[PDB]
């Protein structure tokens, strides 16, 4: 009833496992359709084959930059950027899926998964989903990042698509 999508994660090519995310289209529909369409790839472009470029252990895993692969690109299904839809949902704990951005109303395609409650980001980043299964795979990816976010291994979304 809320869509579910999955990413299959690979570390330098070696399969790691699958993470599935429930997307709260009931509360943040524009934001959640944007992540759903990029996971299926149905508009022509999307997340398949891209990497997690910034992983800061004990905080969050960030990816979604499918154009420049380092945090300087990405785009939404609506344009380069779109507005912050609302701030109903908050960063209550691990598994929260929230949009990364560069300031007010600059959402594109980059997202991050919280591995901690990060209440200081409330009202600054739009929360739109959470880990349904595979939290242990997010924990395992977290072991490859560092204090400044550089990764030891290339963490890529080998495959991704919808499940519900």
Curated annotation (Swiss-Prot):
Specify the PPIase cyclophilin-type domain's residue ranges: 6-162
The places in or outside the cell where this protein is found are: Cytoplasm; Secreted; Nucleus
Impact noted for substituting residue 124 to Q: Acetylation-mimetic mutant; no effect on its interaction with TARDBP
Q: Modified residue Phosphoserine is at which positions?
A: 76
Alphabetized, the UniProt keywords read: Acetylation, Apoptosis, Cytoplasm, Glycoprotein, Host-virus interaction, Isomerase, Isopeptide bond, Nucleus, Phosphoprotein, Rotamase, Secreted, Ubl conjugation
The record lists the effect of residue 120 to H as:
No effect on peptidyl-prolyl cis-trans isomerase activity
The UniProt record lists the keyword NADP? no
Q: Where is this cross-link: Glycyl lysine isopeptide (Lys-Gly) (interchain with G-Cter in ubiquitin)?
A: 27
Q: Explain the post-translational modification.
A: Acetylation at Lys-124 markedly inhibits catalysis of cis to trans isomerization and stabilizes cis rather than trans forms of the HIV-1 capsid. PPIA acetylation also antagonizes the immunosuppressive effects of cyclosporine by inhibiting the sequential steps of cyclosporine binding and calcineurin inhibition. Acetylation at Lys-124 favors its interaction with TARDBP.
Enzyme Commission identifier(s): 5.2.1.8
* Primary location class: cytoplasm
Report any one BP term from Gene Ontology.
positive regulation of protein phosphorylation
| One Pfam family, short name | Pro_isomerase
Per the record, residues carrying N6-acetyllysine are: 27, 43, 75, 81, 124, 130, 132
Family matches, as Gene3D superfamilies = Cyclophilin-like
Q: Which SUPFAM superfamilies match?
A: Cyclophilin-like
GO-annotated cellular components: cytoplasm; cytosol; extracellular exosome; extracellular region; extracellular space; ficolin-1-rich granule lumen; focal adhesion; membrane
- Keyword Phosphoprotein in record: yes
Give the family, as the similarity comment puts it: Belongs to the cyclophilin-type PPIase family. PPIase A subfamily.
What does the UniProt function comment say about this protein?
A: Catalyzes the cis-trans isomerization of proline imidic peptide bonds in oligopeptides. Exerts a strong chemotactic effect on leukocytes partly through activation of one of its membrane receptors BSG/CD147, initiating a signaling cascade that culminates in MAPK/ERK activation. Activates endothelial cells (ECs) in a pro-inflammatory manner by stimulating activation of NF-kappa-B and ERK, JNK and p38 MAP-kinases and by inducing expression of adhesion molecules including SELE and VCAM1.
Task: Note the subunit structure.
Answer: Interacts with protein phosphatase PPP3CA/calcineurin A. Interacts with PRPF19 isoform 2 (via N-terminus). Interacts with isoform 2 of BSG/CD147. Interacts with FOXO1; the interaction promotes FOXO1 dephosphorylation, nuclear accumulation and transcriptional activity. Interacts with integrin ITGA2B:ITGB3; the interaction is ROS and peptidyl-prolyl cis-trans isomerase (PPIase) activity-dependent and is increased in the presence of thrombin. Interacts with MAP3K5.
Question: This protein is called what?
Answer: Peptidyl-prolyl cis-trans isomerase A
